[PDB]
Write a protein that binds this ligand. Structure first.
Ligand SMILES: C[C@@H](NCCCF)c1cccc(-n2ccnc2)c1
Ligand SMILES: C[C@H](NCCCF)c1cccc(-n2ccnc2)c1
Length: 330
């Protein structure tokens, strides 16, 4: 089997991407944030505290003839940005782009933090990291990808995120028309439950490539590119007037600037992030201070190849017995 779904930026900055997901019988379509940095499929629901729902589409398990309470199971998750949600668990039929899994754990939110409420465009998350990170207790549950894997033509999914445009998530096949050149594959460690890999270095603009190992994660659910402070300082030193602002919480730069590109290594290959991808616009409405798309990971404890990096590439999440990542230009 295969599936193919379009993923669409939630706003003009590509702060996140939503992908329609069918849940239940008859289908209830929710727009989920596909997140290769977590392993829970959780949704706004008929059980979510009413004051915490503000425009989201909800899953109502009582209207699904295939929904079953997973008795005793609860979930609770905290994200790197301080946001959180928790609740109980149903199994139900879940379809993405034509690919159907029966008996998928659908985690129904009873509570969500203010940030989730305030984002009307995101009806929940669909985790695509390793199932070892799934938060369901007392019986850990499998991701949608892990449940689909055995049925897929090839045990893979691909992320093809757009810059200020729709893109695609494919399951079970590699669309050879969606990238240029060849796919370079690189080793993955699953020890922390992430798609964790080692970049071979970087360049800033037309500068010379610096060979240096940068361990980090391929994370579609993180907006920005978080790298070591040395690398980030080297980038922003090429932008007149850029500075790290403690008050704003990262590197800012004059909105009048034209940003240099950023290149990262994948083995002997190179992925070039155009400068415009690194512009996240005014810090506050009408400001001439703009927020940078490359930020320090020093305060996180991991480097994160988020959307800024991944949307410059066609990315293969290879879930073969030994997982690997693939990157191609596009
Ligand atoms: C509440 C929500 N806001 C996202 C706003 C733009 F998208 C949030 C805050 C912190 C982290 C995350 N997150 C989700 C998966 N990985 C990380 C989401
Ligand atoms: C939503 C966005 N960048 C992507 C989300 C961070 F992963 C942005 C645009 C303008 C300003 C900020 N900002 C201000 C203080 N800290 C952050 C963030």
């Amino acid at each position: 089997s295969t599936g193919s779904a379009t993923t669409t930026p939630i706003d003009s900055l590509d702060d996140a991407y939503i992908t329609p997901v069918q849940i239940g019988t008859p289908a209830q379509t929710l727009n989920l944030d596909f997140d290769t940095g977590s392993s829970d499929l959780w949704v706004f629901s008929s059980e979510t505290t009413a004051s915490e729902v503000d425009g989201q589409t909800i899953y109502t398990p009582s209207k699904s003839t295939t929904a079953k309470l997973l008795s005793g199971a609860t979930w609770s998750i905290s994200y790197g940005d301080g946001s959180s949600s928790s609740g109980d668990v149903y199994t139900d039929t879940v379809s993405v782009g034509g690919l159907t899994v029966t008996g998928q754990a659908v985690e129904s939110a009873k509570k969500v933090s203010s940030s989730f409420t305030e984002d009307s465009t995101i009806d929940g998350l669909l985790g695509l990291a390793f199932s070892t990170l799934n938060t369901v207790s007392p019986t850990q549950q499998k991701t949608f990808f892990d449940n689909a894997k055995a049925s897929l033509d090839s045990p893979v999914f691909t992320a093809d995120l757009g810059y200020h445009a729709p893109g695609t998530y494919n399951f079970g096949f590699i669309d050879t028309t969606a990238y240029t050149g060849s796919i370079t594959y690189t080793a993955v460690s699953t020890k922390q439950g992430f798609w964790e890999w080692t970049s071979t270095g970087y360049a800033v603009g037309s500068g010379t490539f610096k060979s240096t190992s940068i361990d980090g994660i391929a994370d579609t659910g993180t907006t920005l590119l978080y790298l070591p402070a040395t690398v980030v300082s080297a980038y922003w030193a090429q932008v007149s007037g850029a500075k790290s602002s403690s008050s704003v919480g990262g590197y800012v730069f004059p909105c009048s600037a034209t940003l240099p590109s950023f290149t990262f290594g994948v083995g002997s290959a190179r992925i070039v992030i155009p400068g415009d991808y690194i512009d996240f616009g005014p810090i506050s409405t009408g400001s001439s201070s703009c927020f940078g798309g490359i930020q320090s990971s020093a305060g996180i404890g991991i480097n994160i190849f988020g959307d800024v990096a991944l949307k410059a590439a066609f990315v293969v999440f290879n879930g073969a017995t030994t997982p690997t990542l693939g990157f191609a230009s596009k």
